[PDB]
Amino acid sequence: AKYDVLTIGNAIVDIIARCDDSFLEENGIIKGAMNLINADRAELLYSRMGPAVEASGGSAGNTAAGVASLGGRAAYFGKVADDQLGEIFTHDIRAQGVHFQTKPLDGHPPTARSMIFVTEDGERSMNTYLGACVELGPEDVEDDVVAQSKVTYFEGYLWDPPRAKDAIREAARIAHAHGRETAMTLSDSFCVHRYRSEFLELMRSGTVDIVFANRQEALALYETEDFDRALELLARDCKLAAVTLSEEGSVVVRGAERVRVGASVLEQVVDTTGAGDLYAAGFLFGYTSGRSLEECSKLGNLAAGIVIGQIGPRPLVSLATAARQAALVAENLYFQSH
Amino acid sequence: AKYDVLTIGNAIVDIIARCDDSFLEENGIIKGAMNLINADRAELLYSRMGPAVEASGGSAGNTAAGVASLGGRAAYFGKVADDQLGEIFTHDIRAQGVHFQTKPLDGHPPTARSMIFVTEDGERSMNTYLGACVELGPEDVEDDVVAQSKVTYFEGYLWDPPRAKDAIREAARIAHAHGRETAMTLSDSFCVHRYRSEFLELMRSGTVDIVFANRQEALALYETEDFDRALELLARDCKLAAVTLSEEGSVVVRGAERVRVGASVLEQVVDTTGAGDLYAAGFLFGYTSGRSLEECSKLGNLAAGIVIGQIGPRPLVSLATAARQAA
Ligand SMILES: Nc1ncnc2c1ncn2[C@@H]1O[C@H](COP(=O)(O)OP(=O)(O)O)[C@@H](O)[C@H]1O
Ligand SMILES: Nc1ncnc2c1ncn2[C@@H]1O[C@H](COP(=O)(O)OP(=O)(O)O)[C@@H](O)[C@H]1O
Ligand SMILES: Nc1ncnc2c1ncn2[C@@H]1O[C@H](CO)[C@@H](O)[C@H]1O
Ligand SMILES: Nc1ncnc2c1ncn2[C@@H]1O[C@H](CO)[C@@H](O)[C@H]1O
């Protein structure tokens, strides 16, 4: 094995700015959700937006910058164009130390982008134009790479493009056949409605081993307001399934075993963007260096919470080095012994 | 008059990331300085650089956004390309409410970009590739706009590209011909060595009324370690000049007059990039709505301070708000 984690997901650059509640209703944007938009809507939304800040995103791409940051070894397959947006995206995931070799488009569509509006509550509302991401398919599976990677992890978000599901059946095959595990995030609670069924059967066929989701996503995957009930069904359909509970932290599920680890207490909720992504990043960093579900959920919340103190979805410095070093400096500020 | 401040400057997109000191010196990057680099040095540095975040920059660009955020009317001249970086630069400065109409390049060179390496002390070391910026010249001056703008502010950083200074001699001329005032920033201590003489002439000719500078730069301008000496000469070469002094604040100079104002005291110095630029924004916003020198200095320090507690060279927050909230 050469990689702990491989992620496959929509390669997306994030253009982010603050706005208020009325902005989102005035523009018919769904608060909290990922809104899918054509290129004309990306241009229109952009023009109505305040000055923004741009940062590499992509749900799966974040989770791989995550693992690399935590200390792990990671690799990523994404769809980007031969343009300035893609050249940045490329560099950003590489400078994490992730393996990124996927071939870029060469003209239109241009690199995918997402108009991310953060409200005062740290909630984030996304409006994503897929660009280059629709061209992602089976041709883009690096073969050797899926085989050398302990987990393979990929977005529900990948159902939207046309032929990403076929780059997926395929990496699920390659990876299982090499004694490896497959993982997914449910992405968003509307993705969940738009592919309830594709998602389930994709679990039941034991194509996907591990399932990450937030509470709404889980409630909605089994069309229900009963959360306990939903925890059972989710246990039946995969080996392993982690569920984010925002501030409550997490509840991992394995048959009737339910590891509830709680979440840090945060200074401010600045920008929620990137949380679930970094929860899973930490968790899998734990999981692929053999660690308890207990110490896994912990690595989860720890990583989530750091990224929520930030305009942006990705740690711009090694969490390995920072989290340790923070911890040392508090100790010595509190005049405590190590 | 229609605009309070017009700035003219190297239009640049900042690419920003952390590094340590050792990194700067393995790459022969002068710390705290602005380092010019060809396209090939850009690709190379970029690859050696950690994950970055990106934001509209440009010394004059920031200053113009600054004036708008505070509530003033601003405009900007600078050269971008018809590419994705140019499109962002364009959006950000327009979304501040700044007037920007300068026509982009179409093709090569591409939109300028500066790789800004921030060390732990929040000093910032910049490696800028001018790209589309060399294409800036007299043809890019909007005559009516310069005549309509109470102050016309421009970077000393514009003596690096070939024909920028010509656009400049033109705009100073249009401005004085309409009863307006021109200002400039000395930009970088090294920029100062590179043009020590042009700059002084710019002043003594009365082309530049007002001068903005930090401490190191004021000294370079007169090659002297005597700071008061440096201040005396500066009062002789221009109508008015403001010198920022980091944590000490600013001192402003007008003949024999010396208005010193302290900096706000800060919680965190995160990223020092943009400080000299927002200082001038605050100062010129106060200056162009008829405020005393003291109040100009306060507004300058307020805005410098807010931006230094932030990754990115332009404040995320509404400055008109922070100015009102501080009374
Ligand atoms: N309000 C909060 N306070 C502290 N940590 C939080 C908070 N919200 C989210 N997190 C962290 O990031 C993860 C994901 O948050 P969650 O609400 O489950 O939804 P999502 O996947 O939509 O971002 C958490 O499980 C946790 O570690
Ligand atoms: N350490 C600091 N604490 C509070 N304010 C500061 C600090 N450093 C700079 N400033 C603010 O930014 C302005 C620019 O400071 P200076 O270091 O002289 O700028 P430059 O970035 O042009 O070298 C100051 O006049 C001040 O208001
Ligand atoms: N349709 C999408 N597919 C994959 N990632 C997305 C999509 N829409 C938004 N994102 C990513 O979601 C992240 C956090 O959940 C962001 O950084 C952003 O890039
Ligand atoms: N050669 C240059 N001319 C004008 N502004 C620059 C130059 N290089 C970097 N900058 C900008 O200087 C700022 C603060 O001084 C940053 O936003 C950065 O983009």
Side-chain angles (χ1 to χ4, degrees), chain A residues 1-119 121-222 224 226-338, chain B residues 1-222 224 226-323 325-327:
Chain A
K2 199 186 193 321
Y3 308 102
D4 308 295
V5 203
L6 170 71
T7 81
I8 302 200
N10 286 318
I12 299 174
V13 183
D14 284 4
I15 327 219
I16 305 149
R18 223 121 203 167
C19 82
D20 45 5
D21 269 349
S22 38
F23 186 100
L24 307 173
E25 328 161 12
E26 284 157 36
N27 296 274
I29 307 198
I30 316 181
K31 195 179 177 176
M34 112 105 139
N35 307 251
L36 268 166
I37 74 187
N38 56 32
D40 296 297
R41 183 132 219 256
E43 163 155 43
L44 182 163
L45 260 12
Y46 197 41
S47 78
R48 318 194 178 172
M49 189 177 91
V53 92
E54 24 298 316
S56 312
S59 175
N62 284 338
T63 294
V67 173
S69 246
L70 293 177
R73 312 150 292 154
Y76 174 77
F77 303 156
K79 235 341 137 182
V80 297
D82 182 9
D83 57 27
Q84 259 165 351
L85 243 34
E87 163 195 346
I88 275 166
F89 175 105
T90 287
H91 170 286
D92 285 343
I93 196 76
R94 283 183 198 164
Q96 290 291 324
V98 167
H99 169 91
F100 185 63
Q101 282 306 315
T102 290
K103 202 213 216 40
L105 230 42
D106 290 15
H108 289 60
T111 293
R113 77 162 133 301
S114 181
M115 289 336 323
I116 302 181
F117 300 106
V118 194
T119 41
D121 48 30
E123 257 337 286
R124 54 87 175 108
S125 302
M126 294 170 306
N127 292 280
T128 299
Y129 156 66
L130 294 156
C133 304
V134 292
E135 301 296 349
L136 172 91
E139 327 143 286
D140 285 311
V141 179
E142 276 149 84
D143 202 336
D144 47 316
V145 185
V146 190
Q148 312 173 291
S149 290
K150 301 197 205 189
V151 188
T152 294
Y153 172 84
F154 72 86
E155 304 137 350
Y157 275 148
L158 270 192
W159 271 239
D160 286 319
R163 313 152 51 239
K165 67 213 262 141
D166 321 320
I168 290 312
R169 102 163 81 269
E170 210 62 45
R173 212 213 34 89
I174 303 184
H176 273 168
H178 282 71
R180 284 1 167 155
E181 266 168 309
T182 70
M184 92 188 296
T185 147
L186 272 25
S187 290
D188 166 54
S189 84
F190 288 84
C191 207
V192 171
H193 301 83
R194 176 164 74 263
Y195 307 102
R196 217 140 106 176
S197 61
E198 280 99 331
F199 278 9
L200 291 173
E201 157 68 21
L202 161 98
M203 291 163 80
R204 300 171 170 158
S205 53
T207 301
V208 178
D209 292 320
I210 310 153
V211 163
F212 302 74
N214 60 38
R215 171 189 201 108
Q216 281 322 319
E217 284 148 23
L219 293 179
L221 169 70
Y222 304 110
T224 176
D226 179 10
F227 187 55
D228 281 335
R229 170 98 201 195
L231 278 182
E232 292 173 355
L233 311 168
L234 168 79
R236 308 198 180 162
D237 305 353
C238 57
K239 294 179 203 185
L240 189 42
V243 170
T244 59
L245 301 163
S246 334
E247 72 290 3
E248 245 54 71
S250 90
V251 52
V252 184
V253 149
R254 197 146 67 173
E257 189 183 4
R258 311 214 158 319
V259 187
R260 317 189 154 171
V261 176
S264 16
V265 218
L266 289 171
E267 275 276 296
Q268 357 209 273
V269 185
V270 177
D271 177 23
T272 265
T273 292
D277 301 345
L278 260 109
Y279 176 91
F283 181 122
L284 298 185
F285 172 69
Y287 192 89
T288 75
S289 49
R291 289 185 213 243
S292 30
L293 296 199
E294 235 263 342
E295 213 188 332
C296 266
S297 298
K298 279 178 198 278
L299 275 162
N301 303 107
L302 169 70
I306 291 180
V307 88
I308 294 195
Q310 216 189 44
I311 268 308
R314 288 181 196 178
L316 310 170
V317 296
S318 160
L319 294 208
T321 279
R324 207 211 29 212
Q325 273 296 341
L328 269 38
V329 181
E331 266 183 12
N332 133 320
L333 288 162
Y334 288 128
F335 204 42
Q336 294 173 345
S337 59
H338 181 7
Chain B
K2 190 161 192 282
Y3 299 103
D4 292 297
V5 185
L6 158 70
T7 74
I8 298 144
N10 283 316
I12 301 165
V13 175
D14 293 358
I15 310 189
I16 306 163
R18 181 131 271 158
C19 76
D20 51 42
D21 273 336
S22 39
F23 176 113
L24 296 182
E25 68 184 290
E26 312 174 9
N27 303 265
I29 299 178
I30 322 166
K31 160 169 208 205
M34 105 89 341
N35 311 245
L36 275 164
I37 60 164
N38 59 43
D40 291 312
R41 186 143 216 253
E43 185 166 9
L44 184 154
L45 245 24
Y46 195 36
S47 71
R48 306 202 185 175
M49 180 195 89
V53 65
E54 32 288 316
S56 293
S59 197
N62 298 329
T63 296
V67 177
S69 189
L70 291 160
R73 308 151 286 161
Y76 178 76
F77 307 156
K79 230 339 109 118
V80 290
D82 188 23
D83 50 32
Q84 263 162 341
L85 262 42
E87 158 169 13
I88 284 156
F89 183 103
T90 292
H91 163 286
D92 288 336
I93 197 129
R94 282 193 196 153
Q96 301 283 354
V98 170
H99 168 102
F100 172 74
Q101 289 310 324
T102 296
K103 185 223 209 55
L105 230 44
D106 308 349
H108 276 69
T111 310
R113 84 201 133 265
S114 181
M115 280 133 201
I116 314 226
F117 290 100
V118 188
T119 40
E120 296 232 321
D121 52 12
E123 256 321 315
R124 57 92 181 107
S125 312
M126 311 173 292
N127 312 279
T128 310
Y129 164 68
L130 291 176
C133 288
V134 283
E135 284 315 311
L136 187 96
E139 13 141 67
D140 289 303
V141 166
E142 305 163 47
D143 292 3
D144 49 320
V145 146
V146 181
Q148 297 163 284
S149 292
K150 309 176 178 172
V151 171
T152 297
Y153 174 84
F154 71 82
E155 297 154 352
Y157 272 136
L158 286 185
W159 271 236
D160 299 323
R163 306 149 42 198
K165 56 186 165 161
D166 308 322
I168 290 303
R169 118 160 87 262
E170 209 39 28
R173 185 200 76 57
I174 295 157
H176 289 134
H178 272 90
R180 263 43 150 127
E181 286 183 298
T182 66
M184 70 164 306
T185 151
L186 264 36
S187 295
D188 177 44
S189 52
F190 297 94
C191 198
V192 170
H193 290 119
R194 202 144 69 252
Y195 307 96
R196 208 166 147 184
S197 53
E198 289 89 335
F199 283 166
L200 287 165
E201 161 66 16
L202 219 31
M203 303 173 52
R204 304 178 170 150
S205 40
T207 308
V208 152
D209 304 302
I210 297 135
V211 173
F212 283 89
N214 78 15
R215 199 190 168 99
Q216 287 328 295
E217 290 147 7
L219 301 176
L221 176 57
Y222 294 115
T224 171
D226 192 358
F227 189 54
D228 302 346
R229 185 69 198 207
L231 278 164
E232 250 185 30
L233 303 149
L234 175 50
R236 273 187 228 152
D237 300 341
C238 60
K239 266 173 201 139
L240 172 48
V243 191
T244 73
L245 312 154
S246 311
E247 74 289 359
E248 256 56 50
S250 67
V251 46
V252 167
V253 146
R254 189 153 59 167
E257 191 194 353
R258 299 284 191 268
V259 161
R260 40 273 293 235
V261 180
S264 9
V265 202
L266 311 150
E267 276 318 14
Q268 267 287 219
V269 175
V270 186
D271 177 14
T272 230
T273 298
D277 312 333
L278 275 141
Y279 177 104
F283 184 101
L284 286 178
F285 172 71
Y287 190 80
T288 56
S289 48
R291 271 174 242 266
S292 92
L293 293 185
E294 201 198 12
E295 304 176 57
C296 288
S297 304
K298 292 174 181 313
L299 277 164
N301 290 102
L302 173 60
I306 288 171
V307 84
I308 272 175
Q310 204 203 59
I311 289 278
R314 311 167 178 184
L316 276 77
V317 303
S318 186
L319 290 175
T321 304
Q325 277 164 4

